Nucleic acid binder design. Structure first.
Ligand SMILES: [Mg+2]
Ligand SMILES: [Mg+2]
Ligand SMILES: [Zn+2]
Ligand SMILES: [Zn+2]
Ligand SMILES: [Zn+2]
Ligand SMILES: [Zn+2]
Lengths: 162, 162
DNA sequence: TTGACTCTCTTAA
DNA sequence: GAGAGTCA
DNA sequence: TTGACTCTCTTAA
DNA sequence: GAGAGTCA
């Protein structure tokens, strides 16, 4: 809600609840042929999810608290960042999973960045393969690699140059 | 419906029309601190665009030809790839700009690949900065770089480990 | 047969 | 990646 | 007050 | 990144 104290109370109650979610170990590519280990705190697959949590989409949840007799509600991964600017360079800030695991609510696996920065981590070579993200990736992006391009650049005639 | 010869004729008429688009020289980052040059064949900003071309969205166009009294229409960048498979790994193939310039219709700046592969080129370090795309990028992706993350991973208490 | 508009849709963050 | 409404 | 559902929306390829 | 309709 409005005051700084109330926002801190929201963050603390969220952390305490998420801190009781099952801790699931995931071994992940780091880039550079190296592997690491992440510990994701995973929201349950089905209700009940935890105090204050409800599922609004297949992989979307919201956190809800009653403050000053009014219901306040946030996207479930946005709560750690409630004291941060909600935009950057005129772009909305989004919760962004460094572990690329939407059920995870570990705030040590989340950052707060534009949707473009968020998306781009999907292709990052990873912290041991050349990640240049200022807020460093925890793993190589799941979509990193050569791709599966069906056809490359080509012309039939002689009208074009690169 | 349309024979291989008729499809080749469509591709040829498309190339002949696009080849007359204004050719714009762009200096571009290649990665590795190097600069290169791309020559984009840019569809006009407003009608008329060229024989067979019409705008269906702010940065969307279609190519239309009528053959044996039947109207055929294609996305304007898909025409070079009409003799190629249209899906791969269960994913639809998309026209993908290697120059990241949607108005460009130079077929030497296009490839044909999944939407994920397409998107990922936005963050590629480029052909001189570590591109691993099997069909190599022509330039560093426009969104490559350290990003502008507002807040990184953090917790207030001690409930979490990474 | 053609141009210049109109509309809505897909994907996965 | 989001916000908000309907019920119990 | 809290839980468990429902719906549609944003972005930029 | 897409497909399709209307009108003259
Ligand atoms: Mg993400
Ligand atoms: Mg693209
Ligand atoms: Zn995680
Ligand atoms: Zn990274
Ligand atoms: Zn181009
Ligand atoms: Zn590349």
């Amino acid at each position: 809600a409005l005051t700084n104290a109330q926002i801190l109370a929201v963050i603390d109650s969220w952390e305490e609840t998420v801190g009781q979610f099952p801790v699931i170990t995931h071994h992940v590519p780091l880039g550079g042929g190296l592997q690491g280990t992440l510990h994701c705190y995973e929201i349950p697959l089905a209700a009940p999810y935890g105090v204050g949590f409800a599922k609004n989409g297949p992989t979307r949840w919201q956190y809800k608290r009653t403050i000053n007799q009014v219901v306040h509600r946030w996207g479930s991964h946005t709560v750690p960042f409630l004291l941060e600017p909600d935009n950057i360079n005129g772009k909305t800030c989004t919760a962004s999973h460094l572990c690329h695991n939407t059920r995870c609510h570990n705030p040590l696996h989340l950052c707060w960045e534009s949707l473009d920065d968020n998306k781009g981590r999907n292709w990052c070579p990873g912290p041991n393969g050349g990640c240049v993200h200022a807020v460093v990736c925890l793993r190589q992006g799941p979509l990193y690699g050569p791709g599966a391009t069906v056809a490359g650049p080509q012309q039939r005639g002689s009208h074009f140059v690169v």
